[PDB]
Ligand binder design. Structure first.
Ligand SMILES: NC(=O)c1ccc[n+]([C@@H]2O[C@H](COP(=O)([O-])OP(=O)(O)OC[C@H]3O[C@@H](n4cnc5c(N)ncnc54)[C@H](OP(=O)(O)O)[C@@H]3O)[C@@H](O)[C@H]2O)c1
Ligand SMILES: O=C(O)c1cccc(Nc2ccc([N+](=O)[O-])c3ccccc23)c1
Ligand SMILES: O=C(O)c1cccc(Nc2ccc([N+](=O)[O-])c3ccccc23)c1
Length: 315
């Protein structure tokens, strides 16, 4: 179950999400990534931001060594963090990710966010008033550097994350563009289904990759605790009963049948193994329309500060 990217490579339509909050011991990422591979996940989504590339890379190393998978069976994603947007920082950033994960190449490298930050040691550098320090970078120059990483063989494919239509077009229309992004990884679930952006992406042969497909981890740093719980949605729950699956599986299957590539983070063995069952059933066309009706234009992630970033994706 793969989709062919616009550069010829193939991406598994179901991906394993690896981010866990800092309070989760780093050893867990190692353990759960092994479980995901064991359960059948082949697409694995990580990032410099996640402070887990070492552990995810080790899980992969481990599963290749015991003969469970070969490197070419694994689709590994990393992401360029926002403090490394300046073109001269892009390759060293990728090389550091590769060294961390002890990998020769990533299958996919993304610009994590269009919201550039001041270069520095910290992920989120703050000024004397404690506000995170923004940077101004022409993302086309960052993209040019990304294209060079694909030519350098360090990334099989390159894409973007958290771009809106405008920002995507700024890349697609860049003079002398060599590689279109193969994808745009964005927040996508029944309360924020991104149908318009999805249509655009399809027209450009760019894959939309859904995150927070299960309603996010509801981290207090960014998510209003009073936001509605996605997996408690009555319509989703009613559909779960009908198909005798779970609301989570309803949510993941929704994306698959819309031609969206869907991520799913779980650090629980049984939920990890449940999630692969997404390939076991179909939603009806009428089920699909029903779920389309849930859209509330609701992004779980909020940030008063970044809402003012010139490149804030949500207008
Ligand atoms: N590019 C970006 O900016 C961005 C932003 C957010 C996420 N992502 C990527 O997308 C991945 C997933 O998105 P997400 O982190 O927001 O989490 P998510 O996929 O929306 O999952 C949210 C929660 O669902 C629970 N869950 C998983 N399977 C379940 C099931 N079958 N039944 C019930 N609950 C279930 C998990 O809890 P348990 O762990 O206890 O199972 C998890 O904390 C992330 O790990 C990251 O790799 C990227
Ligand atoms: O500093 C940390 O340890 C730390 C850790 C995790 C996340 C963030 N924050 C963010 C990550 C990514 C995006 N993003 O656009 O992709 C963000 C956008 C707005 C606000 C925060 C973001 C910071
Ligand atoms: O990659 C992760 O797993 C990850 C983990 C934690 C936080 C974020 N944060 C965010 C990503 C993207 C946007 N965004 O503008 O699209 C955000 C906006 C506001 C606050 C946080 C954001 C991403």
């Amino acid at each position: 179950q793969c989709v062919k990217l616009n550069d010829g490579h193939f991406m598994p339509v179901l991906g394993f999400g690896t981010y866990a909050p800092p309070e989760v011991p780093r050893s867990k990422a190692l353990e759960v990534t092994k479980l995901a591979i064991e359960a059948g996940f082949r697409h694995i989504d990580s990032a410099h931001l996640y402070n887990n590339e070492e552990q995810v890379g080790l899980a992969i190393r481990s599963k290749i060594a015991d003969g469970s998978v070969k490197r070419e069976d694994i689709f590994y994603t990393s992401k360029l963090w926002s403090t490394f947007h300046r073109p001269e920082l892009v390759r060293p950033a990728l090389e550091n990710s590769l060294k961390k994960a002890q990998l020769d190449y990533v299958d996919l490298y993304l610009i994590h966010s269009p919201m550039s930050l001041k270069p520095g040691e910290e992920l989120s550098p703050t000024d004397e008033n404690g506000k995170v320090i923004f940077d101004i970078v022409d993302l086309c120059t960052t993209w040019e550097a990304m294209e060079k990483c694909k030519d350098a063989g360090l990334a099989k494919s390159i894409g973007v994350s958290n771009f809106n239509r405008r920002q995507l077009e700024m890349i697609l229309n860049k003079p002398g563009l060599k590689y279109k992004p193969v994808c745009n990884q964005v927040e996508c679930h029944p309360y924020f289904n991104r149908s318009k952006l999805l249509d655009f992406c399809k027209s450009k042969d760019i894959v939309l990759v859904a995150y927070s497909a299960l309603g996010s981890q509801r981290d207090k740093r960014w998510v209003d605790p009073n936001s509605p719980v996605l997996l408690e949605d009555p319509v989703l729950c009613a559909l779960a009963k009908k198909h005798k699956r779970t609301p989570a599986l309803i949510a993941l299957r929704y994306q698959l049948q819309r031609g969206v590539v869907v991520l799913a983070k779980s650090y629980n063995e049984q939920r990890i193994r449940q999630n692969v069952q997404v390939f076991e059933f179909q939603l009806t066309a009428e089920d699909m329309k029903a779920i389309d009706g849930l859209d509330r234009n609701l992004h779980y992630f909020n940030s008063d500060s970044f809402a003012s970033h010139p490149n804030y994706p949500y207008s």
